[PDB]
Amino acid sequence: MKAPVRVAVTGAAGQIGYSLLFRIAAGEMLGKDQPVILQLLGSERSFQALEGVVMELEDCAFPLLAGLEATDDPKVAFKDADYALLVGAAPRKAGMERRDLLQVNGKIFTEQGRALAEVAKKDVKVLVVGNPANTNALIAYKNAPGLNPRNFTAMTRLDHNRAKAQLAKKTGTGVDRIRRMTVWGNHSSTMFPDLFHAEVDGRPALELVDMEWYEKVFIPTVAQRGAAIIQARGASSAASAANAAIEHIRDWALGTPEGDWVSMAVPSQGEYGIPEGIVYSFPVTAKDGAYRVVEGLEINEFARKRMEITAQELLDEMEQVKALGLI
Amino acid sequence: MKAPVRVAVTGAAGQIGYSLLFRIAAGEMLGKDQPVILQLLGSERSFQALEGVVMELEDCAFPLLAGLEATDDPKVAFKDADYALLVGAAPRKAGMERRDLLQVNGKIFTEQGRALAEVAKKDVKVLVVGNPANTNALIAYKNAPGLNPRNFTAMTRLDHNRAKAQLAKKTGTGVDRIRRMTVWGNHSSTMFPDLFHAEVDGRPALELVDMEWYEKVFIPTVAQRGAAIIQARGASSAASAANAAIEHIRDWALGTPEGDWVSMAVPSQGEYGIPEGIVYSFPVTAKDGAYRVVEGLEINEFARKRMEITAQELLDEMEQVKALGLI
């Protein structure tokens, strides 16, 4: 019954893409009732492999995959897009250095932000997964004037799900009984998983775990989880990253559960005193494709201190791209 | 919610497993109201990687994943298993030849079949994905007397789905409009994709395509699809294989569509004159864990000749295994 929506995905030939595309085509991201047209962007160096992923998708015989198109042109991939998941970012090359990587991503997201503004749906919902996510998102939306800045987001949902997982393990309770988890700030080592408002079966998390565990075990473990997966598998956390991206878009479009909220890095509008413009993760609720930061939460010194640390790191990153004239 | 079911998956740290486990945990295989307990089996050399996969699974915060346990002991993995997906098989490297690969596979499935008969549920539903799928299935159930051999199957659903995809592409119709596709025999190059009873939007397939295309384009393309993926991606078709495994179990456990059927390699009972005992793919309908071969279909010379060729190959493979005392 529902008309198909177009889902653009970049870095479609990479690991995250490989774990992402099939679940999207299966209807797990926008609903089992929502047909999807996948428009995949891949570099010329990976277009061959991309065609390979296209065949595998066809080989799943997905009833909801109403369209499938791979391209090397951003203006084609983003044409009339309703959703855009920017997974592709600067590659990891031995020579590729910090500031150099910043120049590559500056070009990628400047070009993609412009393409989105030119050819995608004006209300296109964008999610940046490619790292550095928050800053890449900033470059993108700043270079997409004409488009609602709040339609540009970065992913901290994996950090958020990782936090929920650790809490459920410690309390010995089902992860489905964990609510109001929050990861503030940047998707980096400065991320701040907040347990002051989290609940386990309706009971405050800090009534089940002590501050010592929270500060010395919980936070660092959530922060190092990504490294943990790489050391164990010798490969990145593609499947769980794809899952978080799916949930990030899903909750944004379909809505968050009553009484709960999720983490989303979005352009700050001064909420909780956080500097404006930077893409900062906030606790958010969503309804009908629009989200709203959860305001009014009590913030103690412990939380404030870490919220500013991560905020400052984002300002530093923003300063650098600004100094390079990228925004 | 339904009572939790135990799903065992071997070769869980491999590529198919990486594209399979998350979707099962998401409820895509047995339904959104069916909690699942994942019991994963991995080799001693891949156990570290499996531990990493376990973490990624936890990091998805799946509400339906009621249990998760990794082990390198088959008797642990198959303990009270309701479903068993045997994906791990012999790794074909350099040097190791035919008879050699047959020995390792022989030890694998003789041990796993014995473990299943000893610790799994008596009505455990088994699906063999690891190649040679059909013959490994034979070895398994042969080494699991007592357990109903009909509960042991091999996967041809990927060939099946690939065939539906090719017919859909050729006819310019939605793949969801493709019904009654059949893949007969062995999961190998002698596989026979049957278009004589298939319909495209309710119309006989051969009324839309001719024998020349069917024989010279359709059959070869379906048979070579696996290689097509490898040349394009430089890696095997893991995501589509995982999807095929999910659908094989799903349609078997829940049920096939009204007026439609699917392909499953099952121990032969003389249907259509196929030799008894060999695991042979047949067009089948299924409901609540029980399948039935669709008998009475008209078989012309073209179909019969190809059905016999693949059946003879299966007989040979069976002979070789019997010669090694594996069965």
Assigned token pair, B122: 């008596």
User: How many Å apart are CA A175 and CA A196, to the nearest integer?
Assistant: 17
User: How many Å apart are CA A42 and CA A53, to the nearest integer?
Assistant: 11
Domain locations in chain B as residue ranges: 2-154, 155-326
Query: What is the residue type of A30?
Result: L
Assigned token pair, A28: 């797990």
Q: What is the largest CA-CA distance in chain A?
A: 54
Cβ separation A240–B28 shorter than 8 A? no
Assign domain B2-154 to a CATH class.
alpha beta
Using an 8 Å Cβ cutoff, are A285 and A293 in contact?
no
User: How many Å apart are CA B19 and CA B15, to the nearest integer?
Assistant: 6
Residue with the two structure tokens 């309706």: A202
User: Strands B36-41 and B5-9: what pairing?
Assistant: parallel
Distance of CA A179 to the CA centre of its chain: 19
Of the candidates B160, B187, B197, B248, the residue annotated as catalytic is B187
User: How many Å apart are CA B18 and CA B241, to the nearest integer?
Assistant: 11
Distance of CA B54 to the CA centre of its chain: 23
Query: How far is CA A317 from each of CA A3, A114, A126, A163, A322, rounded to the nearest angstrom?
Result: 40, 21, 21, 25, 9
Distance from CA of A50 to the nearest CA of B (A): 7
- Chain A residue whose CA is closest to B58: A165
Cβ separation B229–A56 shorter than 8 A? yes
Q: What is the CATH number of domain B155-326?
A: 3.90.110.10
Beta bridge partners of A37: A6, A67
Please tell me which of the candidates B59, B165, B168 has its beta carbon nearest to residue A237. Answer: B59
User: How many Å apart are CA B327 and CA B320, to the nearest integer?
Assistant: 10
User: How many Å apart are CA B40 and CA B22, to the nearest integer?
Assistant: 12
Query: What is the residue type of B12?
Result: A
Please tell me which of the candidates A18, A21, A26 has its beta carbon nearest to residue B28. Answer: A26
Of B237, B170, B206, the closest CA to residue B302 belongs to B206
Q: Which residues contact A79 (CB under 8 A, 6 or more apart)?
A: A6, A39, A119, A120
H or E, element range at A75: helix A74-77
**Angle at CA A25, nearest 5°, toward A24 and A30?**
50
Number of other residues whose CB lies within 10 A of the CB of residue B323: 11
> What Rg do the C-alpha atoms of chain A give, in angstroms?
19
- Chain A residue whose CA is closest to B21: A239
Show the 3-state SS of chain B: CCCCEEEEECCCCCHHHHHHHHHHHCCCCCCCCCCEEEEEECCCCCHHHHHHHHHHHHCCCCCCEEEEEEECCHHHHCCCCCEEEECCCCCCCCCCCHHHHHHHHHHHHHHHHHHHHHHCCCCCEEEECCCCHHHHHHHHHHCCCCCCHHHEEECCHHHHHHHHHHHHHHHCCCHHHEECCEEEECCCCCCEEECCCCEECCEEHHHCCCHHHHHHHHHHHHHHHHHHHHHHHCCCCHHHHHHHHHHHHHHHHCECCCCCCEEEEEECCCHHHCCCCCEEEEEEEEECCEEEECCCCCCCHHHHHHHHHHHHHHHHHHHHHHHCCCC
User: How many Å apart are CA B134 and CA A32, to the nearest integer?
Assistant: 33
Within 8 A of B232 by CB-CB distance, chain A residues are 48-49, 51-52, 55
Using an 8 Å Cβ cutoff, are A237 and A14 in contact?
no
Q: Which residues of B51-60 are buried (b: 16+ CB within 10 A; e: fewer)?
A: bbbbbbbbbb
> What Rg do the C-alpha atoms of chain B give, in angstroms?
19
Cβ separation B178–A61 shorter than 8 A? yes
Whether the bond between A283 and the residue before it is cis, its omega within 30 degrees of 0, is: no
DSSP B111-122: HHHHHHHHHS-T
Beta bridge partners of A5: A36
User: How many Å apart are CA A87 and CA A113, to the nearest integer?
Assistant: 13
Q: Could you give the strand order of the β-sheet that contains A65-71, starting from the edge strand earlier in sequence?
A: A65-71, A36-41, A5-9, A83-86, A125-128, A152-154, A262-267, A279-287, A290-293
Of A180, A227, A245, the closest CA to residue A206 belongs to A180
Task: Give backbone dihedrals phi and psi of B153, rounded to 5 degrees, phi first.
Answer: -135, 165
DSSP code of residue B255: B
**Angle at CA A180, nearest 5°, toward A176 and A184?**
125
Assigned token pair, B184: 């007969």
Q: Does A58 touch chain B (CB under 8 A)?
A: yes
User: How many Å apart are CA B11 and CA B14, to the nearest integer?
Assistant: 5
- Chain B residue whose CA is closest to A52: B232
- Collapse the DSSP code of B126 into the 3-class scheme (helix H, G, I; strand E, B; otherwise coil) and give the result: strand
Of B61, B63, B115, the closest CA to residue B88 belongs to B115
Using an 8 Å Cβ cutoff, are A117 and A144 in contact?
yes
Which residues in chain B (163-182) have CB-CB distances under 8 A to chain A?
A: 164-165, 168-169, 174-176, 178
Using an 8 Å Cβ cutoff, are A67 and A4 in contact?
yes
Query: What is the residue type of B132?
Result: P
Q: What is the resolution of this structure in A?
A: 2.0
Phi-psi sector, B120: left (phi>0), alpha (psi -120 to 50), beta:
beta
- Collapse the DSSP code of B47 into the 3-class scheme (helix H, G, I; strand E, B; otherwise coil) and give the result: helix
Q: Which residues contact A88 (CB under 8 A, 6 or more apart)?
A: A10, A11, A12, A14, A41, A42, A43, A108, A130
Q: What is the largest CA-CA distance in chain B?
A: 54
Assigned token pair, A1: 């019954």
Distance from CA of A239 to the nearest CA of B (A): 7
Cβ separation A60–B239 shorter than 8 A? yes
Task: Give backbone dihedrals phi and psi of B260, rounded to 5 degrees, phi first.
Answer: -125, 175
Q: Which residues of A86-102 are buried (b: 16+ CB within 10 A; e: fewer)?
A: bbbbbeeeeeeeeeebb
User: How many Å apart are CA A180 and CA A194, to the nearest integer?
Assistant: 9
- Identical fold between B2-154 and B155-326: no
Of B22, B141, B214, B66, the closest CA to residue A22 belongs to B22
- The structure was resolved experimentally with X-ray
Q: Does A3 touch chain B (CB under 8 A)?
A: no
DSSP A256-311: PPTT--EEEEEE--SGGGPPSSSEEEEEEEEETTEEEE-------HHHHHHHHHHH
| Residues of A with catalytic function | 187
User: How many Å apart are CA B279 and CA B151, to the nearest integer?
Assistant: 11
Q: Does A157 touch chain B (CB under 8 A)?
A: no
DSSP code of residue B95: S
Number of other residues whose CB lies within 10 A of the CB of residue B37: 18
Mutation to test the B interface, candidates A48, A56, A62, A69, most B Cβ within 10 Å: A56
Question: Distance from first CA to last CA of chain A, Å, rounded?
Answer: 42
Assigned token pair, A35: 């047909």
